[PDB]
Amino acid sequence: HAKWVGESATAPEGVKPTAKATWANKTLVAEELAVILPIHENVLADATEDLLAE
Amino acid sequence: HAKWVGESATAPEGVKPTAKATWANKTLVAEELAVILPIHENVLADATEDLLAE
């Protein structure tokens, strides 16, 4: 931020102010979603629907 | 402002009243806004962004 300042050579308000800016960091971290669906091969052969597609 | 004057050559109410306008003054006065942004030369060189432009 700026400040209002005087034209003084000795008095404490002729001095212009110092200031700074700052940066920070945010992250993406990859994590895994998974499932395993086991089935017996005779059930695949006996069923009327395609259970591997289901 | 005007007034309701009368008509005599001798009575006080025959005289037309004298009156006055007036002006005043307003001023602009310039004053100073400022800031100083100090930064270290190595940080300026090692950063990926053009921090002097920022």
**Chain Cα centroid distance, residue B46:** 48
Method of determination is cryo-EM
* Binary contact (A18, B38; C-beta < 8 A): yes
Resolution value in angstroms: 2.6
Q: A20 to chain B: which residues are within 8 Å by CB?
A: 37-38
B51 burial (CB, 10 Å; 0-12 / 13-18 / 19+) is middle
Q: Which residue of A has its CA nearest to B54?
A: A21
**Chain Cα centroid distance, residue A28:** 5
Q: Give me the residue from A4, A16, A21 closest to B31, CB to CB.
A: A4
Whether the CB-CB separation of B54 and A23 falls below 8 Å is answered with: no
